[PDB]
Amino acid sequence: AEIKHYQFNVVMTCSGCSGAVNKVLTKLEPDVSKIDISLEKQLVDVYTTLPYDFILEKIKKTGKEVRSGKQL
Amino acid sequence: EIKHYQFNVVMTCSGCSGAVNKVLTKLEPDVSKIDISLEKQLVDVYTTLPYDFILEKIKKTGKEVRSGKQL
Ligand SMILES: [Cu+]
């Protein structure tokens, strides 16, 4: 039950782009604790007890381009 | 038997529409044509696959789907 911190570089070009990604991840609450998105930096930060590959696949299935991901 | 489905999807930029297009292209060639209009907020899908399967693929983008119908 450790909360891990994953960070993704995701191509998002409007508030709708970011809102869509936030929607799909927020649906995983309470297993997702917090989502931060920065349009400036094209970053998605996910704080969660879920595995990295699970989170990555939920983002990829949005159709948004994921340029990188990592665990912090 | 090729069905024509049409969805009203809230899409605000080419990144929104490109995402919808991307999830649909993963189903080629069973999805044989995809036409998306930002101006009209419309996604037209021509496919042999079931309506609900297509709808669920589109709902996974996280975009709002206002309605869908088979033409
Ligand atoms: Cu967008």
From Swiss-Prot, chain B:
Molecular function GO labels: copper chaperone activity; metal ion binding
Record has Chaperone as a keyword: yes
PROSITE patterns xrefs: HMA_1, HMA_2
Regulation: Tetrathiomolybdate directly and reversibly down-regulates copper delivery to secreted metalloenzymes.
Record-listed Cu(+) binding positions: 13, 16
Quaternary structure annotation from Swiss-Prot or TrEMBL: Homodimer. Interacts with CCC2 via the copper anion.
The protein's role, per its UniProt record: Copper homeostasis factor that specifically transports copper to the secretory pathway for incorporation into copper enzymes destined for the cell surface or extracellular milieu. Shuttles copper to the transport ATPase CCC2 on a post-Golgi vesicle for eventual targeting to the cell-surface high-affinity iron uptake protein FET3. Protects against oxygen toxicity.
Family of the protein in this entry: Belongs to the ATX1 family.
This protein's name: Copper chaperone ATX1
Source species of the chain: Saccharomyces cerevisiae (strain ATCC 204508 / S288c) (Baker's yeast)
Lineage: Eukaryota, Fungi, Dikarya, Ascomycota, Saccharomycotina
Gene field: ATX1
